[PDB]
Amino acid sequence: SIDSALNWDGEMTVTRFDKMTGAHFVIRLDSTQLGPAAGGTRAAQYSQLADALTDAGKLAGAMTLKMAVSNLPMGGGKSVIALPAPRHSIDPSTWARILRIHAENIDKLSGNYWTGPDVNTNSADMDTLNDTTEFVFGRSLERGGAGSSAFTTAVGVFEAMKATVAHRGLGSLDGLTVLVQGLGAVGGSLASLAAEAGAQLLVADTDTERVAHAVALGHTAVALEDVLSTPCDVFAPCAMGGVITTEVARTLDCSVVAGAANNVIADEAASDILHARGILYAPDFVANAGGAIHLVGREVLGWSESVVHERAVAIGDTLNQVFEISDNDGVTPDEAARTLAGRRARE
Amino acid sequence: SIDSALNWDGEMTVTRFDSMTGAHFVIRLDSTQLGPAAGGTRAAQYSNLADALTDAGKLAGAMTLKMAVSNLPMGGGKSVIALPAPRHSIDPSTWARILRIHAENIDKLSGNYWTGPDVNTNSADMDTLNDTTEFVFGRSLERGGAGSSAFTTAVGVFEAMKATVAHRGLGSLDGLTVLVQGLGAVGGSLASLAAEAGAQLLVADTDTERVAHAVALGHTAVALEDVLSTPCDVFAPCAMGGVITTEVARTLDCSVVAGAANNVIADEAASDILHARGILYAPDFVANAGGAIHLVGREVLGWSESVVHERAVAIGDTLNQVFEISDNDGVTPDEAARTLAGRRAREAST
Ligand SMILES: NC(=O)c1ccc[n+]([C@@H]2O[C@H](COP(=O)([O-])OP(=O)(O)OC[C@H]3O[C@@H](n4cnc5c(N)ncnc54)[C@H](O)[C@@H]3O)[C@@H](O)[C@H]2O)c1
Ligand SMILES: O=C(O)C(=O)Cc1ccccc1
Ligand SMILES: O=C(O)C(=O)Cc1ccccc1
Ligand SMILES: [K+]
Ligand code: NA
């Protein structure tokens, strides 16, 4: 919206336009209070620049909260590259220039922003960025980075889901129906984990093959148009953000929402409805923090893989703390998580 | 619109919004090719944020060329602070908060951008910025800065005016009529300079005190409504930019345009029109370069005051080169200036 695009209260917005590629670049540094801003690079198509600006600020603010609540010494930032065509349709040469320009932008911030992967960007892209700027996390193991953080994120989301299920009074995942929306790197692993835990998995993905494979594995497909109306115990959004609008919140037929997506909730009203409806939501910025713990933990703190897994597991404990505040103060899980974030950040 | 404002070819745009003060902040880095981007901080009210962005881009682009054509090893950048109220109304606390925020923004650029004064910002403000960030030119003398660059700018503009009048075949300033729009820091000195060289001055300013003072000095006041319709030999815009629109270029009644104002020409056609009508224009980015020569010369290059003075005087020579290319190649002075800028920059890199 105009407000989220222009009247954003974060510390800094960096924009650039490259006529040659037709790509627009946005970097939003929400906060550098706890340290340099850090957050991945999302590359996607947007209807209007306003949307790209809006998303960057929402994602950046989520990163600040995520580092805060996760006890990681970094601020929150995010880059959004507004593509002139579908990612898949971008030619190699064009993509390469795009990354080059993005790296130059990051470089000007001289360490006030550290990037990483996000939607449509990967370790190879991080490496390419690294060919021009030092401020990049998530480079391939071969190039010196921590590599993929997908599994770590999956672990964090899974533990989040277990803690939530337990708090909601459902006991364990065993015998629960979990609807995973998005069978990507993280969602795929999450499904595997929950299935191993005894849950029955309902899955949805825009990629046919992905779905058929899941089915091949014993899972059950859910048509796209049926996703939001399909009864389940847990709804696990692991695709795009903004899924839970007020209307969605009013009609979701589950008892827990716990997934990997960023900015899952469309507005505060949605969050209240869920609460009111007895649907326990595990706040995104808490639940999906595994990625950040992996990259920051490994690359900044020198933590081993085992340690980062351990810390990702502790996301369950953080959520238990979130739930306690929610229950005690009678506020939504999101509010409670913001409160915890502030307390941990020593605000 | 914002969308159109954002379709800018510069290297980087920095923006920020401070809800508490209601101020908007823009930093535009046009180029860092020749060195870190550098340019002043303009603080004013804008109708739309988009206008602030557009202004910043045009100002930043002029800085690129200015440094290049002036042989200064720096890129071009500019800051624009979109005020939530008339600058005068801004209480000291709010102003102080605005500057601190601006300083933080500059600071994140970590030296890829060096600021300085511009409209509504002064050496005191530079000192304040410097409380927070290192990348500031124009600090007070006490603070380690070179202070005001206004006189140096005036000297350069004056020399520019002389060169242009001469090139235009009008001879010397003595006896010529010069219209000085804006009797500010620069305009005031310029008026003094020209008057000393024998010019008859017509003056205008929104500050009535300023006008009276000039009249007291023997100058002739011009009503604001009349400024662009007043016949003169030389038109010296030393207030706001964009004065010379296409429409104004068609009717301007003077032989030379040479002032201190930034981005004097509103649209390209205006430039073409002045050229076609035989009104010799000394490009702003060349003519007003005394400010930059002073700041960069003093604070970066190690130049003495005398040398700075010499360099500013040399603006007339640069203009002579500009007009020379304009005449040979048949292009406008602005185009010839850009050409010269590009030559120098190469040479400067070669
Ligand atoms: N590149 C730079 O750093 C830079 C820095 C400062 C000034 N400048 C430029 O040069 C111009 C002169 O700067 P200055 O230091 O002398 O500024 P200044 O504020 O000291 O003086 C500007 C003068 O113009 C007057 N004015 C405003 N609107 C007017 C109008 N419509 N008609 C007549 N007078 C009007 C103001 O009242 C003031 O007396 C600036 O406005 C800007 O374009 C450039
Ligand atoms: O975890 C995320 O959502 C990201 O944005 C990836 C990331 C995390 C931490 C630092 C840099 C990038
Ligand atoms: O005189 C100018 O062009 C300025 O904008 C003031 C300034 C000059 C050089 C560097 C920074 C600011
Ligand atoms: K159960
Ligand atoms: Na703020």
Ligand code: NA
């Ligand atoms: Na099954």
